[PDB]
Structures are given as structure tokens and as C-alpha cells.
């Protein structure tokens, strides 16, 4: 018996929280592999479902998105992807169409999740209403906070259900995660769950 494993490419502008988000899964950070010529650290994030164990091999840049775009060798053969932006910085959100264009060019029809990071910060600029355009392009969306572990499992559980072809798949146990570095205010979480229902109802 082999191992069920998928290549996942994590992309988005420099400074949005890609490396802080991938590093919450403790054992994946411990067993990571650095490949200098591709400009990547591949993290093996194992998750335990009701039908057995699965492995997401998450590709995280080495910081070469700050002064340029990514090569075709980073994208080739990916089976799924995450695009990230910061919700306190509008320029990171406006570059989302161009990250999506690269994924489509090299990989065609793969399941992709869009993530808005840094929702623990009070003065938010990009809100639920501005994500409607991306949902019409077939991206799935979640509000995330990498520092407090808010909604960490959501992107990986939606991607596992799509790939396997089972809408009733569940995780039976959570992976060991880095302890929260900030508190996710509970009044802000309830308001943002309300914003998303109002924007996407009907």
C-alpha cells in the first residue's frame, strides 16, 4: 500500500502571511525539505480522515515573489492550490487575478481556495462584499488568522472533499498546532460570519 499524496502550491504577494500560515502544522515544519534551485521549502502536512490518512505536500516560497514572478517549474504538476492576500492591504487583493492567471495557464482545471489572512487586526480594509467577484470565477473563499489558528483546517478539508469526490468526508482528529500568539476577538468573528452570510445569501 502506497501513500495518498497531493502537490499543493501556496502563492500570493510578499508580506501576506504565507510562511506564518504553513508553519502552524508543527510536524510538517519539523520534517520540511529545502530545495535551493526551485526556491521552495516543501512541508508534508498529514491529516487524518474517516476514510484514512492523506498527505498535502505544501510548497512555500523562499521569498522570490518580492522582486519578481514565479517560474514554471514551481507550478508544474500541482493538483490543488491556495492564493493568499492580506485584508489590511488593498494592493495585495488587487494582484489576485494575476496569481490566478498563472495557475490556469500551467495547471488548467484544478481546485483552488482563496484566503484572506490577518483578520485579528481591528482596522480591516477588504471586506466580504469585495470577494463576490472571485466566487463567480469559481474560487472557494475563507477568512483566516494564521497567528491565532482561526479557521486553519477549512481550506484543507474543502480541498480533500473535492479531490476524493466525497462531500461527507471528515477529519477524525486535529493535527498538533503551534499555540496561538494572539487572541481572535469573539465579537469580530461573529460580525464577519454575519458579513459573509449577507453577501453570499441567495
Give residues in contact with a copy of itself (CB under 8 A): 129, 132-133, 135-136, 138, 198-202
Nearest CB to ligand GDP, comparing residues 62 and 76 = 62
Q: Which of the 8 DSSP states describes residue 174? A: P
Question: Which of residues 49 and 118 has its CB atom nearest to ligand GDP in the complex?
Answer: 118
Angle, CA of 85, 43 and 47, to the nearest 5°? 90
Give the footprint of Mg ion on residues 9-38 (CB under 5 A). Answer: 18-19
Quick check: 42 and 57 in contact, CB under 8 A? yes
Residue 121: Cβ-neighbour burial (10 angstroms; 0-12, 13-18, 19+): middle
Residues 6+ apart with CB under 8 A from 169: 49, 50, 51, 157, 160, 161
Comparing CB distances to ligand GDP, the nearer of 14 and 73 is 14
Is residue 95 within the footprint of Mg ion (CB under 5 A)? no
- Give the nearer residue to a copy of itself in terms of CB position, either 19 or 140: 140
* 3-state DSSP assignment of residue 33: strand
Q: Nearer Cβ to ligand GDP, position 4 or 189?
A: 189
Q: How far is CA 130 from CA 10, 134, 161, in A?
A: 22, 8, 26
Q: In whole angstroms, how close is the CB of 153 to a copy of itself at the nearest point? A: 12
The contact set with ligand GDP (CB under 6 A) reads 14-20, 117-118, 120-121, 145-147, 182
Residue 199's binding partner among ligand GDP, a copy of itself, Mg ion, none (Cβ under 5 to 8 angstroms by kind) is a copy of itself
Residue number with the smallest Cβ distance to ligand GDP: 17
For residues 14 and 85, give the distance between their C-alpha atoms in angstroms, rounded to a whole number. 9
Q: Which does 118 bind (CB under 5 to 8 A by kind): Mg ion, a copy of itself, ligand GDP, none?
A: ligand GDP
Amino acid at each position: 500500500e502506497p501513500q495518498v499524496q497531493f502537490k499543493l502550491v501556496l502563492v500570493g504577494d510578499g508580506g501576506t502571511g504565507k510562511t506564518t500560515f504553513v508553519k502552524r502544522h508543527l510536524t510538517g515544519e519539523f520534517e520540511k525539505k529545502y530545495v535551493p534551485t526551485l526556491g521552495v521549502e516543501v512541508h508534508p502536512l498529514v491529516f487524518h480522515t474517516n476514510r484514512g490518512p492523506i498527505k498535502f505536500n505544501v510548497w512555500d516560497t523562499a521569498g522570490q515573489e518580492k522582486f519578481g514572478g514565479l517560474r514554471d517549474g514551481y507550478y508544474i504538476q500541482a493538483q490543488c492550490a491556495i492564493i493568499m492576500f492580506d485584508v489590511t492591504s488593498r494592493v495585495t487583493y488587487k494582484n489576485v487575478p494575476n496569481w490566478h492567471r498563472d495557475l490556469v495557464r500551467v495547471c488548467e482545471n484544478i481546485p483552488i481556495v482563496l484566503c484572506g489572512n490577518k483578520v485579528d487586526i481591528k482596522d480591516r480594509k477588504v471586506k466580504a462584499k469585495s470577494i463576490v467577484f472571485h466566487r463567480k470565477k469559481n474560487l472557494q473563499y475563507y477568512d483566516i488568522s494564521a497567528k491565532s489558528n482561526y479557521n486553519f483546517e477549512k481550506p484543507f478539508l474543502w480541498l480533500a472533499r473535492k479531490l476524493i469526490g466525497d462531500p461527507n468526508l471528515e477529519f477524525v482528529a486535529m493535527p498538533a498546532l503551534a499555540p496561538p500568539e494572539v487572541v481572535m476577538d469573539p465579537a469580530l468573528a461573529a460580525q464577519y460570519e454575519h458579513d459573509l452570510e449577507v453577501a453570499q445569501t441567495t
